[PDB]
Amino acid sequence: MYTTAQLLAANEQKFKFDPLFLRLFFRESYPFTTEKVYLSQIPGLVN
Amino acid sequence: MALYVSPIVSGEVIRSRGGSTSEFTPGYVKPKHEVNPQMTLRRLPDEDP
């Protein structure tokens, strides 16, 4: 009943989470319209 | 060099200098290659399906 409680500041507690990989090498993004995806690479070796 | 001919003898006569020639004539190169007209039927690795 008679409590008289006063609340002070709270805490935060977020992660130490920064990608460094969605920002350095994976800068380019594409959506899909198909089901599978190919990834072709031509071996460039002239004679 | 000059060496030392004394002032009593005529001395020897030097061959002046010079003479060297050469030839580097032919050279060639020709990379012929084919277009393969029947290669265009199938799909290239490019040109997304």
Query: Could you please report the per-residue DSSP string of A1-47?
Result: -------------------SSTTTT-------SSSS-----------
Strand, helix or coil at B6? coil
d(CA A11, CA A16): 15
Q: Which chain B residues are closer than 8 Å to A36 by Cβ?
A: none
Q: Which two tokens stand for residue A12?
A: 């935060």
Chain B residues near any Cβ of chain A (below 8 Å): 45-46, 49
Which of A30, A34, A35, A40 to mutate to probe the B interface, most B CBs <10 Å? A40
d(CA A45, CA B34): 16
Show Cβ contacts of residue A41 under 8 Å, excluding neighbours closer than 6 positions.
Answer: B45
| C-alpha torsion sign, points A25, A30, A32, A33 | negative
For the stretch B21-46, what's the b/e string if a residue is b when 16 or more beta carbons lie within 10 angstroms of its beta carbon? eeeeeeeeeeeeeeeeeeeeeeeeee
Nearest chain A Cα distance for residue B24, angstroms: 26
How is residue A14 written in tokens?
């977020």
* Resolution, Å (one decimal): 3.8
